[PDB]
Design a protein around this ligand. Structure first.
Ligand SMILES: OC[C@H]1O[C@@H](O[C@@H]2[C@@H](O)[C@H](O[C@@H]3[C@@H](O)[C@H](O[C@@H]4[C@@H](O)[C@H](O[C@@H]5[C@@H](O)[C@H](O[C@@H]6[C@@H](O)[C@H](O)O[C@H](CO)[C@H]6O)O[C@H](CO)[C@H]5O)O[C@H](CO)[C@H]4O)O[C@H](CO)[C@H]3O)O[C@H](CO)[C@H]2O)[C@H](O)[C@@H](O)[C@@H]1O
Ligand code: CA
Length: 155
């Protein structure tokens, strides 16, 4: 399941050695675009991520964690989110390697007020057993985005 979904502990950000804890990937680090996060952290029980350059596609900035799920089983995906200026983000369940098949994908419009978003999800019979949750923060307005109470739980 999700580790540090309440944000009582710092964001680890070590994709190479601990991808099962929260990490950020940015396209600017890979010669793909200018996509860059200037600051991130936790305070008062929530996560914040400050975008300096959003890149040119939604996946150019990702806030992700690997998770194990059972084939054929139904889950609930839930999270709280907001942003200093109104804009969209995506939420996905996808493979953690090429070809990055998206098993679940939705877009949500954020405002300056905290709101909650909750979706049912059935893991496909032939999906990989280890996948990742991904919040895609690229393309849209450069601003600060906030998260809290992220869960992926059996129905
Ligand atoms: O070593 C060579 C190379 O390495 C670079 O470094 C590595 C870097 O690539 C890797 O980044 C991961 C990142 O890619 C991943 O983002 C994925 C994103 O790739 C994915 O893109 C999809 C496309 O895959 C899909 O394209 C295909 C299409 O073009 C083709 O014609 O048809 C196919 C159909 O059969 C179709 O699949 O196309 C869509 C466009 O609609 C793209 O969206 O999209 C998903 C989201 O859906 C996104 O997650 O994110 C990972 C983290 O989750 C990144 O890790 O990262 C490694 C280390 O982290 C690097 O090693 C260098 O930059 C280059 O210089 C080198 O040459
Ligand atoms: Ca919290």
């Amino acid at each position: 399941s999700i580790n540090n979904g309440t944000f009582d502990e710092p964001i680890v950000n070590d994709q190479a050695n601990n991808p099962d804890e929260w990490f950020i990937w940015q396209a600017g680090d890979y010669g793909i675009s200018g996509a860059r996060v200037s600051d991130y952290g936790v305070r008062d029980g929530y996560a914040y991520i400050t975008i300096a350059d959003p890149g040119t596609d939604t996946w150019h900035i990702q806030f992700n964690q690997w998770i194990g799920l059972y084939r054929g089983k139904t889950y609930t995906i839930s999270f709280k989110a907001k942003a200093d200026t109104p804009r969209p983000i995506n939420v996905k369940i996808l493979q953690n390697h090429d070809p990055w098949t998206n098993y679940f994908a939705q877009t949500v419009n954020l405002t300056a007020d905290w709101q909650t978003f909750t979706f049912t999800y059935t893991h496909p019979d032939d999906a990989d057993e280890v996948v990742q949750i991904s919040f895609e923060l690229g393309e849209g307005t450069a601003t600060t985005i906030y998260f809290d109470d992220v869960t992926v739980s059996p129905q």
